[PDB]
Design a protein around this nucleic acid. Structure first.
Lengths: 49, 187, 275, 115
RNA sequence: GAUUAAUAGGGACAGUCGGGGGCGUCAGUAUUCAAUUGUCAGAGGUGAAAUUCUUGGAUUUAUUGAAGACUAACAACUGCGAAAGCAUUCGCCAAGGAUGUUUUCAUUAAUCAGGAACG
């Protein structure tokens, strides 16, 4: 599923961020993809999932 | 035989072709040969045996580097005089900010080049601004002074302050009674 | 047992102390590859953010391999510890580990390679090198040669210069083979090159009124009285710092017990306050 | 035909004529503008260069080298990379003082690093 | 029981693109320090000067050692990153743009009060 691929990329980016936590542009990539997680998770929780 | 060479670009090629006979004329006058390669774009200057002047080959290497940097051609032939000497000041690594470098280079340029004309009249030089580099000329004292001026206008001291200091320099140098002390109280 | 251990790892999967207790129990029962598996699964299943927990498992793995492993696996886990954690930190921990384990020669080689790599910006690594040589290896001349290399490697920023030289001087004051006379050498040159730093004067007074002669653990009251006099005689003292230095002199003469000198501190304080 | 190495360090305020061996290790002779005119303003002058050049030319002809290969540099670290009036006048006066040149080579210590 | 498949979505895959980021690695010079020699009277600054170093040898010539710094000439009416910004080689790690597809849930969309990350 699309949300499943998004949370896959989310945990991959989180793994790289904890590999080097002083990578703040990739931290910004992480907060962007987390905002996308929140939005699509709510919008596909409204339907019943 | 002792050879110097460099490479000119493909917008300067037409310049060098329609502008070459005077370069090779003055250099035959100094007894040195030179030709123009077009399929590669190199100017090759070759000292002959009839070269009575030994400085003419170093002056010719300075010629070929100014014509590679697209300095005007018989200004570069005016380098064949005694007190003339070229110099280049890179400023793209002196200024670390892109837009501040652009603003400082056009602050150097000034309104309609009036500050450029004032500098070259005050220091008896020629100034060319080739973007990241600046081509300067003149007597060696003038060379030191214009290197000082370009580093201050890159360190954001204004050329109107520098022309103030240079005209005060000029007047306090031409009067003879004040010949040697520290004149920083006037500047 | 393993079942209770799996229960507590189900209860607290983050808990690296119970992780190293688990692999510690497995290094007691001597299945060392199983202990390797425990620490690997620790690095996998501990919650990701907890850097102190993961580096605790890292340090435990380094101790495990320098104890029961071999040179090849200590270098390999050294490498992966670098690529997963802070490089200078894991080098410092392997330095301390070799210090505890007594492998002082390969310790020295790692000290060399860390002072080549991270000697550009870290003063504590040169401090630990000098600490090693004023401890076990007994090379104080080589340590001050390292100090020359240190003022070579670092910038001339105030933290680097004026904090590596007093740290070295303090190490000389705290190690008897380091020669508190070399400590006074460094501090005399420091007060020469900057006579305006009353915090450095105060720190010199601290280490001189502290246990300076480590071979028998006293302070030295003659040169203490001398340096208190010179500190009263240098220029730049604000009245608060002057009162603080007079209080420090008075309290040192109270620990000494010389009431004549205590009275002299009070008389010096009043004749200085008269201004 | 003996060859030599004359290295020039012609800054804008001083000028060093300095002949060394072909290896560049044994300094044969060295003359400056203070051994010349020694005027702290005229310390870099084409005339002072002429004086230094005839001095070293007379000495290198006293020791019989008859030829050179000149090495040219300037303040190549951060200052200007061009040589000076001392350099041009000195080489002119040298090859007017008589010896023959082989190849000419100017090597200035350029940086890839400056700031 | 379930529409056009949107000339708005997000994704997947493949070839790519990037002086984008982080970590390490590889060089390159120039400067400073130190040494070794050849030194052998100034050097050094200036518009003139002065300070200063200078028979234990300055400045120089050459070879090394150590250090920090930055990546010149290619360098742009360019390229990448939202910005500040980004220029040696190589490697690793995620990410991002465009292209194309015989790829899918079919409103998920757009805007910013409050607030939050990077300078």
């Amino acid at each position: 599923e699309d949300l499943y691929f998004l949370i896959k990329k989310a945990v991959a980016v989180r793994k790289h961020l904890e590999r080097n936590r002083k990578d703040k542009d990739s931290k910004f990539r992480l907060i962007l993809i987390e905002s996308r997680i929140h939005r699509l998770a709510r919008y596909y929780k409204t339907v019943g999932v | 035989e002792s050879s110097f060479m460099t490479l000119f670009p493909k917008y300067r090629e037409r310049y060098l072709k329609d502008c070459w006979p005077l370069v090779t004329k003055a250099l035959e006058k100094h007894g040195i040969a030179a030709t123009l390669d077009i399929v590669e774009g190199s100017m090759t200057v070759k000292t002959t045996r009839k070269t009575y002047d030994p400085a003419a080959i170093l002056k010719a290497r300075d010629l070929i580097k100014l014509l590679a940097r697209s300095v005007p051609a018989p200004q570069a032939l005016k380098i064949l005089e005694d007190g003339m000497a070229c110099d280049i000041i890179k400023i793209r690594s002196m200024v670390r900010n892109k837009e501040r470098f652009v603003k400082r280079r056009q602050r150097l340029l000034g309104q309609n080049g009036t500050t450029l004309k004032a500098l070259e009249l005050l220091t008896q030089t020629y100034i060319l601004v080739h973007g990241n580099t600046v081509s300067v000329m003149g007597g060696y004292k003038g060379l030191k002074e214009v290197r000082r001026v370009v580093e201050d206008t890159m360190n954001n001291i204004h050329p109107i302050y520098l022309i103030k200091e240079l005209m005060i320099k000029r007047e306090l140098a031409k009067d003879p009674a004040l010949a040697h002390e520290d004149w920083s109280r006037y500047l | 047992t393993a079942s209770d251990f799996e229960r507590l790892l189900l209860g607290q999967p983050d808990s690296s102390e119970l992780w190293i207790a688990y692999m510690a129990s497995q290094m007691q029962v001597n299945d060392l590859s199983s202990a390797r598996q425990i620490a690997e699964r620790a690095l996998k299943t501990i919650n990701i953010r907890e850097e102190t927990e993961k580096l605790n498992v890292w340090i435990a793995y380094l101790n495990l391999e320098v104890a029961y492993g071999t040179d090849e696996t200590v270098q390999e886990v050294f490498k992966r510890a670098c690529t997963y954690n802070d490089d200078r930190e894991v080098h410092e921990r392997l330095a301390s580990i070799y210090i505890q384990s007594g492998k002082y020669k390969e310790a020295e080689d790692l000290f060399e390679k860390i002072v080549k790599k991270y000697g550009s910006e870290a003063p504590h690594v040169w401090y630990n090198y000098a600490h090693f040589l004023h401890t076990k290896s007994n090379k104080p001349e080589q340590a001050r040669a390292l100090l020359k290399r240190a003022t070579q490697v670092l910038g001339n920023t105030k933290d680097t210069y004026l904090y590596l030289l007093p740290k070295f001087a303090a190490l000389e004051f705290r190690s008897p083979n380091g020669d508190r006379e070399q400590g006074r050498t460094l501090f005399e040159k420091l007060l020469a090159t900057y006579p305006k730093r009353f915090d450095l004067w105060n720190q010199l007074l601290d280490l001189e009124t502290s246990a300076s002669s480590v071979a028998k653990n006293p302070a030295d009251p003659s040169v203490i009285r001398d340096l208190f006099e010179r500190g009263t005689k240098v220029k730049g003292l604000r009245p608060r710092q002057a009162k603080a230095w007079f209080r420090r002199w008075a309290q040192w003469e109270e620990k000494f017990g010389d009431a004549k000198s205590r009275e002299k501190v009070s008389a010096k304080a009043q004749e200085w306050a008269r201004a | 035909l003996v060859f030599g190495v004359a290295r020039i360090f012609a800054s804008f305020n001083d000028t060093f004529v300095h002949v060394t061996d072909l290896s560049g290790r044994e300094t044969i002779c060295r003359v400056t503008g203070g051994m010349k005119v020694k005027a702290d303003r005229d310390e870099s002058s084409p005339y002072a260069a002429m004086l230094a050049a005839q001095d070293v030319a007379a000495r290198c002809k006293e020791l019989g080298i008859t030829a050179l290969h000149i090495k040219i540099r300037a303040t190549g670290g951060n200052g200007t990379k061009t040589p000076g009036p001392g350099a041009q006048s000195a080489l002119r006066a040298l090859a007017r003082s008589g010896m023959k040149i082989g190849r000419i080579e100017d090597v200035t210590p350029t940086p890839s690093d400056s700031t």
